Structure formats: structure tokens, C-alpha cells
Amino acid sequence: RLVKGYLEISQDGYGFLTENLHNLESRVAIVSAGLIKQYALRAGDYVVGQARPPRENERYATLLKVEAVNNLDPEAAKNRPRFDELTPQFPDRQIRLETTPDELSTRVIDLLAPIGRGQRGLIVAPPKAGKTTLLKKIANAVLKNEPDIKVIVLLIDERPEEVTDFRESVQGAEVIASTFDEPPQNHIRVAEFVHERAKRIVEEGGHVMILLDSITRLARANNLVTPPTGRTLSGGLDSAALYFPKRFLGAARNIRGGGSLTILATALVETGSRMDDVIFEEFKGTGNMELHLSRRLEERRIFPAIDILKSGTRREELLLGEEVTHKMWLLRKVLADMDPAEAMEMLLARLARTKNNKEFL
Amino acid sequence: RLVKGYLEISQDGYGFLTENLHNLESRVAIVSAGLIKQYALRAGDYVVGQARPPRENERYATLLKVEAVNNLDPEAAKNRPRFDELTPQFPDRQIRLETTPDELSTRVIDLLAPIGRGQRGLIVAPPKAGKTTLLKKIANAVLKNEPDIKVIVLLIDERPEEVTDFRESVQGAEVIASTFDEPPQNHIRVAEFVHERAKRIVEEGGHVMILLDSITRLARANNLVTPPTGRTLSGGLDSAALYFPKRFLGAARNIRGGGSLTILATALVETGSRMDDVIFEEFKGTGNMELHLSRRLEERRIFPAIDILKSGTRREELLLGEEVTHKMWLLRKVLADMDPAEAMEMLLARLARTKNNKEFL
Numbered sequence: 001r002l003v004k005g006y007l008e009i010s011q012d013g014y015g016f017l018t019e020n021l022h023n024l025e026s027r028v029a030i031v032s033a034g035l036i037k038q039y040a041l042r043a044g045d046y047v048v049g050q051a052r053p054p055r056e057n058e059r060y061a062t063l064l065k066v067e068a069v070n071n072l073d074p075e076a077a078k079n080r081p082r083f084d085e086l087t088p089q090f091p092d093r094q095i096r097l098e099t100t101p102d103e104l105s106t107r108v109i110d111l112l113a114p115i116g117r118g119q120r121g122l123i124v125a126p127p128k129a130g131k132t133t134l135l136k137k138i139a140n141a142v143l144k145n146e147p148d149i150k151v152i153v154l155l156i157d158e159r160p161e162e163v164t165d166f167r168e169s170v171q172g173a174e175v176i177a178s179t180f181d182e183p184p185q186n187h188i189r190v191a192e193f194v195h196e197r198a199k200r201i202v203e204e205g206g207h208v209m210i211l212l213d214s215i216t217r218l219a220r221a222n223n224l225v226t227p228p229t230g231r232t233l234s235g236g237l238d239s240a241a242l243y244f245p246k247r248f249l250g251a252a253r254n255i256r257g258g259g260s261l262t263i264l265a266t267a268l269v270e271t272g273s274r275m276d277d278v279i280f281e282e283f284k285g286t287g288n289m290e291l292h293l294s295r296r297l298e299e300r301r302i303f304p305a306i307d308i309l310k311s312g313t314r315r316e317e318l319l320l321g322e323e324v325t326h327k328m329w330l331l332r333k334v335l336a337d338m339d340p341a342e343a344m345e346m347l348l349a350r351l352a353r354t355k356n357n358k359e360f361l
Numbered sequence: 362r363l364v365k366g367y368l369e370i371s372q373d374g375y376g377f378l379t380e381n382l383h384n385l386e387s388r389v390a391i392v393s394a395g396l397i398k399q400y401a402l403r404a405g406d407y408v409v410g411q412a413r414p415p416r417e418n419e420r421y422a423t424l425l426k427v428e429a430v431n432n433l434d435p436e437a438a439k440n441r442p443r444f445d446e447l448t449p450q451f452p453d454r455q456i457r458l459e460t461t462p463d464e465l466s467t468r469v470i471d472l473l474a475p476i477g478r479g480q481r482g483l484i485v486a487p488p489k490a491g492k493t494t495l496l497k498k499i500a501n502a503v504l505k506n507e508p509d510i511k512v513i514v515l516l517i518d519e520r521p522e523e524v525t526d527f528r529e530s531v532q533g534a535e536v537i538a539s540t541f542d543e544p545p546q547n548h549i550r551v552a553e554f555v556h557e558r559a560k561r562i563v564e565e566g567g568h569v570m571i572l573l574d575s576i577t578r579l580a581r582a583n584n585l586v587t588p589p590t591g592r593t594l595s596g597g598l599d600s601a602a603l604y605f606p607k608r609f610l611g612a613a614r615n616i617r618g619g620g621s622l623t624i625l626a627t628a629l630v631e632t633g634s635r636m637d638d639v640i641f642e643e644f645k646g647t648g649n650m651e652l653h654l655s656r657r658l659e660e661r662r663i664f665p666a667i668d669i670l671k672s673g674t675r676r677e678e679l680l681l682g683e684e685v686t687h688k689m690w691l692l693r694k695v696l697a698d699m700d701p702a703e704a705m706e707m708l709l710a711r712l713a714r715t716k717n718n719k720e721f722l
């Protein structure tokens with residue numbers, strides 16, 4: 001009998017193998033501390049192994065033998081550089097964007113913010129600005145441009161029917177979701193489990209995409225979970241709550257020894273709460289990529305409703321050639337001085353004629 | 362002897378059958394934990410059954426036998442998917458509106474926010490902006506367009522005489538009311554009971570329609586009831602009180618297995634308190650419909666006093682055909698630029714000539 005799951009090591013030295021729901025389930029498989037020490041297994045490690053029905057007085061199946069860890073033969077787990085000791089460097093492998101149903105979005109993103117491997121990016125938009133739809137387009141583009149990259153879609157505290165829509169429209173990539181009906185406890189648990197899985201995969205030199213809608217809601221759950229920390233930060237935030245979201249996002253990095261962790265998350269702003277603004281400014285100092293969306297552009301029904309002037313990445317030269325670098329610099333200079341909605345309107349009109357490369361030509 | 366009511370399960374595993382007043386009554390019928398276990402009854406379930414006079418030393422009549430649960434035989438109770446387990450989808454069945462005493466209002470709403478089954482909608486207006494009268498029009502229009510839909514009206518913390526007006530104007534559709542004379546505890550209890558009833562009916566695939574005036578007042582009661590939660594959001598809002606209103610509203614959804622829960626509620630804004638505005642922005646992120654009414658349009662006595670540009674839904678394509686989609690897109694493009702009051706004036710003048718479908722022609 002074969003069982004599979006993702007390792008979750010408890011406090012007692014033994015662990016369980018989880019399902020896609022990322023929660024304790026009746027079918028989880030027991031993993032003894034002996035096996036964990038035997039294979040240097042770590043939280044989030046994907047374990048596949050033959051198991052047996054539980055004996056009498058046993059409520060969960062026990063993993064008799066470990067077969068594959070993170071899809072590989074487990075000796076390599078013993079002698080590998082730990083994810084935490086991997087050298088972080090800047091995103092050195094740009095990732096072109098193109099999605100057929102709306103490739104305006106992909107070309108505009110590419111012209112506004114290049115994506116590499118190890119990207120620590122954020123999209124900052126008010127509610128109802130295509131934020132979620134842009135995330136969908138990016139997911140589709142990645143699953144066409146980088147099929148090799150494990151694309152993980154994490155949805156925290158968001159709308160269930162949107163969860164269904166992405167699950168259906170992601171063409172099978174790992175969609176982990178926890179709707180707003182769930183308490184922040186569920187959100188934090190699922191997010192951390194997915195995060196650990198991603199770090200374990202990257203520890204195997206893997207390139208991982210995490211499309212995290214509502215990182216702000218994740219921070220909200222973190223604050224709701226932070227037990228006191230004492231004083232209150234301006235806006236209602238807690239001083240020690242944002243440490244966990246900060247670490248969570250900062251995990252995204254490029255590795256010199258193989259693999260990359262790229263987390264692209266969606267940020268809410270212009271929400272009337274100092275809390276949201278403080279979270280945004282706190283995360284911007286950690287991220288390498290920002291794309292700002294304008295509420296007014298959406299109000300005019302101009303899509304993608306991007307605020308071009310505020311958008312950009314850091315170290316684009318590492319993701320773009322000199323010709324492309326000068327092209328983008330020219331484009332920003334031309335558009336820098338002038339109004340947002342008009343900017344998107346003529347950018348769309350000019351890019352609509354042809355693909356971006358010819359739009360240059 | 363027969364009795365009927367709605368099931369309210371106590372902490373001790375037994376329950377009582379309630380009347381329309383949605384509270385403890387002397388006439389409530391005891392329900393043993395047994396019957397609940399056999400019939401798998403749940404809170405809000407409507408139970409009808411032959412009862413007996415209570416024995417000596419008994420204060421409440423006891424349900425000797427269960428005959429029907431939610432108007433259907435008890436067997437289906439044992440084998441049915443739980444409401445929490447129902448797959449949510451987008452509102453896929455538009456509900457077209459009309460009320461004879463004001464077809465202007467209903468047709469403008471249809472042109473501004475088409476309604477589907479499972480709609481999580483909201484109308485946002487300052488005090489004295491027709492929100493109550495508009496809700497009255499919607500109640501009347503639904504009781505003419507969708508008699509099949511169980512029309513439940515919930516009036517929380519609102520003017521009593523308006524309650525009574527709705528009583529003789531709702532034409533018998535279930536209305537559960539709790540004026541501002543009641544404490545917030547009564548509001549919370551009654552709202553939760555009605556909510557559970559609605560979920561239980563939809564669990565039987567029923568299309569349930571909930572018109573909730575004073576949802577902001579419901580949130581006020583939630584905040585007043587929340588025992589501490591420690592910190593406070595800007596404007597005086599509690600950090601954890603709003604979870605319950607959020608879950609309450611998010612219950613509204615479209616079920617892919619049949620039935621729907623469509624909740625439309627009245628929101629108060631421009632009230633001079635950060636609290637109402639924070640509530641509005643927070644529920645806007647959960648609702649799939651917003652219809653904005655302008656105080657100035659009321660002050661000019663122009664009705665309905667709708668702010669067209671701010672009003673709109675999400676996924677209209679699922680509720681309207683392509684011709685209607687293009688028509689409304691054209692109408693907004695034309696109306697996008699015009700002043701609120703004057704835009705409404707021109708709209709009313711044009712639509713007054715004919716039924717909306719001929720106004721298209």
C-alpha cells in the first residue's frame with residue numbers, strides 16, 4: 001500500500017503526511033522520529049512511501065518504508081545544503097510573460113516590471129482593480145512560459161467562487177486556498193505549510209512560483225494571531241506580527257547553487273485604513289518588484305489599469321539586455337511626465353498594433 | 362396535537378421549536394437530543410410534528426414525533442450534503458426586477474446592477490436616501506417576479522413604524538424584525554436564527570432571499586457584544602467583532618448543486634463616523650454588488666437618488682446577454698461623464714418614456 005503527503009513534524013519528534021488541503025486529516029500517515037532522523041526529513045518535505053493499515057489501537061496509517069522524498073531517492077536529503085544556508089542573489093533569469101486571452105497585460109507587465117527567478121514581487125492596487133484578474137493572467141502566462149517551474153497558487157482569506165475559478169483555470173497547478181470563511185488560524189497554518197513545502201523544493205534546487213493573492217490578509221491573520229507584543233503600532237498593527245509575513249516574503253530569493261523561490265503577492269491599498277498603508281510600506285522595503293494599479297483607470301474600464309510611473313523593479317539590468325534597458329528607459333521618460341489613465345490608453349493603443357518587440361520596431 | 366417551529370439546539374444537546382418572534386417563548390416545543398440525532402436535525406431547521414401537552418413537572422410541550430423537517434419528510438435530513446459543504450459559484454441566474462408603483466426604480470437597478478441567485482449585494486447611501494424605500498421596492502418586485510423564492514426580510518435596529526409598514530406592504534413574506542428599541546443581543550440572536558433558517562432551507566436547494574435593512578446596525582450590535590478582543594481598529598471598531606458579520610454576509614452564494622442564498626442589505630455612509638465608512642469598505646470587499654445612492658439627489662427630491670457611476674456589479678456577463686452587456690456598457694460610457702444629479706435626471710426622463718427594453722430600441 002502506497003501513501004504520499006507533505007511532512008509536518010510535530011513537537012514530539014514525529015510527523016504526519018498531509019494532503020492537499022494542508023490540514024490534519026484522518027488519512028494522514030504517521031512518520032516516526034526515527035525515519036525523520038534517518039533521512040534528515042524537514043517540515044514541508046514531500047514524502048512518498050509504502051504504508052500499512054493501522055494496527056489495533058492505531059488511528060492513522062504508519063509509513064513502513066520511505067520511498068521518495070520531494071520526488072527523489074532520500075539519501076540526497078542527508079547530504080544537501082540547507083535552504084537557509086543557500087546564497088541569496090538577485091534575480092538573474094528573467095521570465096518573459098505572454099498569455100493569449102489578454103497579452104496586453106503580459107507585455108505591459110514586461111515593459112513595466114521584468115520577472116526573474118528569485119523575484120520578490122508585489123502588486124499594489126485598491127479593491128476591484130483587476131488585481132485578482134492580473135494574478136490570473138500571470139498564472140496563465142507562467143503556465144505557458146515556464147511549465148518547468150512548480151507553480152503554486154496560494155489564496156488566503158479570499159472569495160470562494162474565485163477559488164473555484166482559479167482551480168478550474170489554473171490547468172492543474174497547485175492551488176491552495178483558504179477562503180475568508182476560515183479563521184486566521186487556518187490561513188496561517190496553510191500558508192506556512194505551503195511556504196515550507198516551497199522552501200524544501202527549492203532546497204532541491206527547484207524553481208518555485210508562489211502566486212499569493214491577499215498577502216495583506218495574511219498579515220491581518222498574523223496580527224490577529226500575535227498574542228500581545230505590548231504597544232500598538234500606528235494604524236492598529238502589531239510590532240511583532242509583521243515579522244512572520246516579512247520572513248515569509250523574504251524567503252523569495254535567487255540561489256547560486258540552483259533553484260529559486262519567487263513569490264508574487266497582491267497588495268491592497270487606498271482602503272481607508274492606516275493598517276493597510278503601513279503593511280504596504282513595510283513590505284515594499286523588502287520586495288524587489290512593485291506594480292501599482294490605479295482605481296481611476298478601472299473606473300474608466302481601461303485594462304490593465306496599471307499606474308505605470310509607480311511601477312517597476314530593482315536591478316532590471318540583470319533581467320533585461322542593454323537594448324531592452326534603453327528601450328524601457330526611453331518609454332518611461334516619454335510617459336513619466338503625463339497622466340495615468342491617458343498613459344495606459346495610449347500604451348494600449350500602441351501595443352495593440354503588434355507584439356512589444358515590433359512595437360519597438 | 363400538532364406543533365411547528367424552527368429548531369434551536371441548546372448547548373446540552375437538546376433544542377426548542379420557536380415562532381416568528383425568533384426567541385424563547387412559553388409555547389416552544391422541547392426536542393430531545395435523541396430526535397436530533399436520528400433525524401440529523403440542525404439549527405434553523407423547520408420542524409413540524411405532533412406534540413402532546415407537557416406532563417406534570419414539565420414546562421414545555423414535547424414533540425412526541427417528527428413529521429416533516431423543512432416541509433419535507435425527515436429521511437432526506439439524514440442523507441444530504443451539508444450547507445457548509447456546498448460548492449459556491451457566481452450568481453448564474455439573473456433576477457429581473459419590476460414593481461408597478463415604481464418601475465423607474467426597478468428598471469434603473471436592472472440597468473445598474475442586475476441581480477442573480479446567490480447574490481451578495483449591498484446598497485450604500487447616507488441617512489434619508491430612500492435606502493429603506495428602495496428595499497421596499499425590491500421586496501415588492503421580488504414578490505412579483507420570483508414568488509418561488511422564499512422572501513425573508515430582516516429589519517435590525519430600525520424604525521418600528523417602518524417595520525409595521527413593511528408588514529402590511531410585504532404581503533405575507535416572512536419578515537423578522539428587531540427595532541432600535543431592542544438591545545443588540547436581541548438583534549444578534551434574531552439575525553443568527555434567521556440566518557440559520559435560511560442556510561437550512563438552501564441546504565434543501567431552496568432559493569432564499571434575505572432583505573436586510575440596517576446591516577451596519579447589525580455590525581454595531583456585533584461590536585457591542587464582542588467581549589474584548591484587546592485592540593481597536595481606527596474609528597472605534599473591534600478587531601474581531603466584524604468576523605461574524607463577514608461570515609453572515611458571505612453565506613450568500615450561488616450553489617452549483619441547486620438553490621441559492623441571495624442577501625441584499627442596506628449600508629449607511631457619510632454619517633460623520635469612521636466606523637460606518639470602515640464597515641462599508643470592508644463589506645464592499647465581500648459583496649458582489651454595490652448600488653450607491655446620493656444624498657444630494659434626495660435633497661433635490663429626485664428619485665431614485667442613485668449614484669450611477671459608483672453603482673455596479675461584478676460578472677454582469679453571467680447575468681446579462683451580450684446585447685444587454687453592450688447596451689449597459691454604452692449607457693455607462695455615455696453616463697460616466699455626467700454629473701450625478703443631472704445624470705439621474707436625464708436617465709429618468711429617457712426611461713420614463715417607455716419600458717426599458719423599448720428604451721433600448
Ligand SMILES: Nc1ncnc2c1ncn2[C@@H]1O[C@H](COP(=O)(O)OP(=O)(O)O)[C@@H](O)[C@H]1O
Nearest residue numbers: 126127128129130131132133134303304675676
Ligand atoms: N483586464 C480586465 N478585463 C475585464 N475586466 C476586468 C479586468 N480587470 C478587472 N476587471 C473587472 O474588475 C472586477 C474586479 O477585479 P478583481 O481583480 O477580481 O478585483 P481586485 O482587483 O480587487 O482583486 C472584476 O469583476 C472584473 O470584471
Ligand SMILES: Nc1ncnc2c1ncn2[C@@H]1O[C@H](COP(=O)(O)OP(=O)(O)O)[C@@H](O)[C@H]1O
Nearest residue numbers: 463487488489490491492493494495659664665
Ligand atoms: N422614491 C421616493 N419617492 C418619494 N419619497 C421618497 C423616495 N425615496 C425616499 N423618499 C423620502 O425620503 C425619506 C427617507 O426615506 P427612507 O429610505 O425610508 O429613510 P432612510 O433612507 O433615512 O432610511 C422618506 O421620508 C421618504 O418620504
Ligand code: BEF
Nearest residue numbers: 126127128129132
Ligand atoms: F476588490 Be479587490 F479584489 F480587493
Ligand SMILES: [Mg+2]
Nearest residue numbers: 128131132133
Ligand atoms: Mg481580488
Ligand SMILES: [Mg+2]
Nearest residue numbers: 492493519574
Ligand atoms: Mg432606513
